[PDB]
Design a protein around this nucleic acid. Structure first.
Ligand SMILES: [Zn+2]
Ligand SMILES: [Zn+2]
Ligand SMILES: [Zn+2]
Ligand SMILES: [Zn+2]
Lengths: 74, 82
DNA sequence: AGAGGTCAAGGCTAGA
DNA sequence: TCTAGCCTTGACCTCT
């Protein structure tokens, strides 16, 4: 019963290097494959939870990379 | 093809085959708890260029054809599978 | 397992 | 106001 290193949601195994949920797995895949560049509309310190992760793409991706998700896979 | 207005369907939405218009209309009608009223004989015809002439008959047609109110999520989370 | 793919949920905001 | 075309998302799915 392990948790996503990004948002704390239930994790389903390792994805792109680190334990994570299906949401952050899918989010990271789409951000890298499509070369998306996000920007925080606030203070670059947005909360990452199941209910609030979708409210800032920039901080979500930043967390993904900081926690160790490997872009090289794609 | 949309079961409500005949417009081209984009897939299943809230239970039945429907277009993006009726998809969004049903979502807005349920989430905002809208009550509409018909200004005629509660029998307005539903087509692409006419569905927007009576919100009451459009919503009644949505429910008749099987659009499910329970398909709007209380937690408001997107994606996944039902 | 852990990649990539599926496709109906909800989100955004032009255009009427 | 409201509409709907298009985008973003994620629990399952197939594939390597
Ligand atoms: Zn996560
Ligand atoms: Zn942020
Ligand atoms: Zn329709
Ligand atoms: Zn009517």
């Amino acid at each position: 019963q392990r948790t996503c290193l990004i948002c704390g949601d239930r994790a389903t195994g390792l994805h792109y290097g680190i334990i994570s949920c299906e949401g952050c797995k899918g989010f990271f895949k789409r951000s890298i494959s499509n070369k998306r560049v996000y920007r925080c509309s606030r203070d670059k310190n947005c909360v990452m939870s199941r209910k609030q992760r979708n409210r800032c793409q920039y901080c979500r991706l930043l967390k993904c990379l900081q926690m160790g998700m490997n872009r090289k896979a794609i």
